[PDB]
Symmetry: D2
Subunit: 416 residues, 4 copies
């Protein structure tokens, strides 16, 4: 009732401002968030779980309950999924393959993802994918695709090519393209003499990695740039410009990770620029805290700004919204929960924006009104709309979800 | 009715989290916001109205309607005040003095501020003050109080000494101490050989400037650092360390300006640290956009942070909340309206936080719940609380205030 | 004699480390620096000299002696040039035209630059050009090529196409291609609603601007990204990505200005990535000081970094080196002097690097040798090498050149 | 003569032209010791628990072989570096570097657990500086130590620090030079924080407790080191800049400024003149951050140079304590120390060779053109020959050759661990 009242009051309020709450909700239903699987087990995977996170990335904290196998992960995702309203997808890492016998990265197969697929099918989730170019013996020098050693490079070329097939298979089965993100950690710790050659090797390898033409309705290739990593602070082969060059020149999607840029730099600004040269965008929405730290997405400035950028431009299809974080210092199910929910709260908010009006004031140089309107948006009752969205998806509206998380912990997590 | 309705619902919602919205309102009214006079006329002042803004600060935009005299300013202020709910104060600069005849900065007197005082009483506003140490022949070298020339330096000293006397007068008259902030533009543009001599002279001058012991119930001295300014980019005499040092040893108030630090640096963090060392804090809430640009204050991450830090620690007495912006690209009144309501909105939300519980969770390492609840706070119905606050203060609840501005503009600003 | 000896020694030290100093000088002679004309008059131009620098760019300080016409400018330039060893070019702005009658920027013609051309011929200078998209009533809104108004746009587009015609003229005449850079201040000062449309317009306009096919051997087009400017702090139409995309897609040259990026962002890193996609690069070596302040180029980390990347990669043809600074607080000739000499020094030091060796150490994981070998170069006698370069070029090797300035000052600048 | 001699003589003249006395410079360089950090020798592992994980928000990156593994190795390693670095040095010790047969609780160390250090110090003519170790420890696992809400955890840390003070004083007493004892804690939060006051308040009262024992300034100086953020502690730092500036001022302790502990673009060279008008002394942790407090080797760069300039400009020979702070585990540790050390010294030399008075004078006259121009020209003045001469005079290799030695030491020695 309370929700209902609150909701009805809000319907009016916004109605008065040319804002349709019901259309907003419906629109929110068209914006699936691809939840990254790796937040479930600290990016450990099933190749070699107990094994060491490498690649300039680090999961911090020692919170208990990480999932230890596929079975647990899915149980975890599910618990998470039932507290997050609306559309979601699952973003899988090659290292999350399910096999009886070990599989050389350069030999993976669709079959090794069969259980995921099936589960996706039963959970009504699309699947996204990623070759795993880190935490590997051959990723030990700090180079994979750009590595000078031909064999090494080949092996990474081979892994990604195969990964494309797994992806293609995902969409074939699921009926939704699987976006396949290519992120390599390649780079240097200190003053480099040759940033050139390594960029060149990368270029050619990427080239080779994409050679195989696959059906766009099943699969999409994306590239992710990064500024620096722990242990590779000085130079990243695959820089922003490198990939911009690449995505543009080869027409692949471009992945923009919110924690991968310079201080003060924001990907929300990059969206509109990039969409004029690259077919599609993949966004790894992350919260960086002074480094690509991978903290949990908040309902904050940048998250909201990203959201607006998407929504304002009706990028329902060319933008694949993903999450990218891995906080190991809190309950991971909650992490996913909070992050996911925030992303959606940010999208809804953007969807409740009287954008045409504002676009309008703006085009007219009425910057006073622009500012004023945007700021007043913040005090409109959008919470009421969020809470109803939750309820229509039979998801807790408020803090109560924590209880569910606290109960699953008790019964399941505490015994791992 | 609707407000009353949303109000009532919010009352319960918050009550459920142990928050008494009524109390919150009462507390808000204990948090005066000191509106800066200079946004009204782009810091032109009345000594030399038309006659260049200098010191590394600048007002941008050529939006019409700026006040041209004290009369216009008070009128503009008043319009602003009626759209801003609750307690406010006016923060004045010396060049805003009123005299028939010109007055040397080194010879200002209370009396050049009499009108101000009477208006202040009429409007039930408190007054704060500031020596004007820029826009002046005597400051064109880029040094005032740190000036090598004994004469010039003496002039600035004397000017600030007189100032304190003005300020002290305000406190006496209004029954509320007047905080007088000390801000100099002293610095260098390029590579500097000696950052020491200027600082030594600044130190000596300030001591000289505050040597006259005045009644604390009437006046308080504050000092504000800065990192860089246009045309004094390389070095700044009164830096952060300089003034933390000064305020700490001399026991003056410390002034923290949100647009005065390094990229990513935040004053929110500084509050709790500084207060452990200085007797009072003066906050210059400002929005920087890649420089000390003085844009209008938004209800954003940082402003919220600021509000939270104050409130969480019951900083009602020791913190003097001020604004510091000067957008000349939009309507000045709106500027003040958006900024002040934004500050108050942040405080109010801060007042509606279940800090005790959060504190307690935090104190137990319950970081999962801290983050969750923190985040869930963002969706509690504070907006209903704000709107009733606006209402109880006969202030517009929403964007309708823009119509008042628009009206005033047409009928009065259009005529300037 | 002293110099002579210094040389021999240096000559030996270096050979001792696989470095041929003769060969460096030779190489240095293959690296011209394009001196920006605008430093001589604080970007006043001849169109409307006494008129007002607009564009989010600024010139600070009030150092006397500014040139006020082509004559002075060329006079000041020559004094500079005689104090700067080796190759140079002049980079001209459209507003530096010479006409008896005022010209609409959309109608400039080669003939408006004939004097510059003949002067260039007499001084063995190549010439570079730039359309002027600021300090103009048609730029007063903060938009030019991306203006929503078709006519304004048109105006700017037109101006640009004409510019290209002047540039080609230069190269046909001079026998070396003129690089024509396109920089526009378009952006917003505050929170922007629509970042997409202005970029779409920009895009289209650009396409139109470059439509007229020119002789590559005479003319080259370059686009220059920027992050933010004063009074346009919140969003910049031609942001990094926009032009990265653009240059790659249309295959124009990319212009990298060292003062246009985020804090801590460096163009030195961008060189080699950009070069795998764009056919050419134009560098605007500048020194930002917490904003694109345009201070004089120092022989510092980034300047040196920039030089290394060029040299390391033998980008003797695809990279066009130019300066970009305008300090109005010190003698302007001095400014060019210090600036270009510095750039030249950075280049030589880079040419003195035992690159093939370091490259090989780094290819082998010999990071220890790398780092040490890198820092030791800093103490080899490159100076004996520089000073000889200077002697051979009949330029002061040392600080003595300050005297020629001081004199010129007296003698000339002093009457202005 | 030797080429070096030639080149020296030439510089000798060039510098005398600008009024600089090269011999005077070298003399001054010898009054500016660089306290080398011991932890670069073993990736901050310590001896308490040599392998067993670095914590507190700092990390050593790189898997370069050879790390020293005990006080003997460390000492030998330090020696090799020292022979390749000219002039004055000091050694900066951390408590975990203690030497004991038995295991010692941090809160109970004693002067006796560093006796070998002291002895070797006198032998080598090194003054010793010190530090309590507040990380890589079970009682520091929650991320709090001196500011921990827990009374016992707090007490523990407090006790260790108090104790650390006695060792430091004992170092001073023995070496005849005060030992600067730096206080750095990793205290902070990884994520959004509710109560930034409480901890800071606790830290405050703890510090007061920590320095309540009156010791001989001639033997001991307490310094406090602020930090912005650490890995796993990115969002809040108890001992923030303002925290310690306020602390050092109000308590008159020295203030530690770590070149890698501040915001993007923030520089410590700027802080020196400011800081010194309020605090008695300064301790500098010259370090090279690369996007985070990563502890990369100090180079001859813009900031290192500026740091030096600021010290030398104000003849800060006694109130400024020049230390190094870096830990790169991806290259030969000896080389690391060597590079960093000489670099600092190179910078210092440059400052000594600068014509300050004239520069200062131009500046005081608004002759900003001369100033800039002259600053730039210093840069191509042959300070190098001077440096090569400082090297020779201290029987340290002048150039790159030092690498050959590191090479050989690694072959024989390092290549066996
Ligand atoms: C697991 C995943 O591939 C990874 O987080 C990348 O997206 C990258 O952003 C981290 O540097
Ligand atoms: C007008 C006012 O005194 C001024 O804005 C100062 O507070 C300072 O923050 C600007 O650098
Ligand atoms: C004058 C010149 O065209 C201009 O400075 C541009 O290069 C741009 O870098 C300034 O923001
Ligand atoms: C080992 C040493 O105590 C440590 O490096 C501190 O100085 C601090 O700067 C690292 O965050
Ligand atoms: Zn990512
Ligand atoms: Zn201020
Ligand atoms: Zn430029
Ligand atoms: Zn340190």
């Amino acid at each position: 009732t309370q929700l209902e009242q609150a909701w009805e009051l809000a319907k009016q309020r916004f109605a008065a401002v040319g804002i349709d709450v019901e259309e907003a909700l419906r629109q929110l239903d068209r914006l699936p968030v691809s939840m990254h699987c790796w937040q479930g087990d600290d990016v450990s995977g099933f190749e070699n779980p107990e094994g060491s996170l490498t690649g300039g990335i680090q999961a911090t904290g020692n919170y208990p309950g990480k999932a230890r196998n596929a079975s647990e992960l899915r149980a975890d995702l599910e618990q998470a999924m039932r507290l997050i309203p609306g559309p979601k997808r699952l973003n899988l890492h090659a290292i999350y393959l399910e096999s009886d016998t070990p599989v050389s990265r350069d030999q993976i197969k669709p079959e090794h993802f069969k259980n995921w697929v099936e589960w996706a099918k039963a959970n009504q989730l699309g699947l996204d994918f990623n070759p795993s170019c880190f935490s590997h013996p051959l990723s030990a020098d700090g180079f994979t695709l750009s590595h000078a050693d031909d064999s090494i490079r080949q092996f990474w070329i081979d892994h990604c090519k195969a990964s494309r097939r797994v992806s293609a298979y995902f969409g074939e089965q699921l009926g939704t393209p699987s976006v396949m993100n290519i992120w390599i950690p390649d780079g240097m710790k200190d003053i480099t003499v040759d940033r050139l050659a390594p960029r060149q090797r990368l270029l050619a390898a990427l080239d080779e990695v994409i050679s195989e033409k696959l059906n766009p309705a099943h699969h999409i290739d994306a590239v992710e740039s990064k500024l620096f990593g722990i242990g590779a602070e000085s130079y990243t082969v695959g820089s922003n410009e490198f990939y911009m060059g690449y995505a543009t020149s080869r027409q692949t999607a471009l992945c923009l990770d919110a924690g991968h840029f310079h201080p003060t730099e924001v990907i929300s600004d990059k969206i509109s620029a990039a969409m004029l040269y690259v077919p599609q965008l993949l966004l790894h929405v992350s919260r960086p805290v002074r480094w690509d730290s991978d903290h949990v997405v908040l309902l904050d400035d940048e998250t909201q700004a990203i959201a607006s950028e998407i929504v304002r431009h009706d990028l329902f299809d060319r933008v694949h919204i993903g999450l990218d974080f891995f906080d190991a210092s809190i309950n991971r199910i909650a992490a996913w929960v909070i992050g996911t929910r925030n992303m959606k709260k940010a999208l809804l908010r953007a969807l409740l924006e009287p954008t045409a009006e504002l676009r309008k004031l703006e085009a007219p140089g009425d910057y006073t009104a622009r500012l004023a309107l945007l700021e007043e948006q913040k005090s409109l009752p959008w919470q009421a709309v969020w809470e109803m969205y939750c309820q229509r998806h039979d998801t807790p509206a408020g803090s109560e979800w924590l209880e569910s998380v606290r109960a699953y912990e008790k019964e399941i997590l505490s015994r791992r």
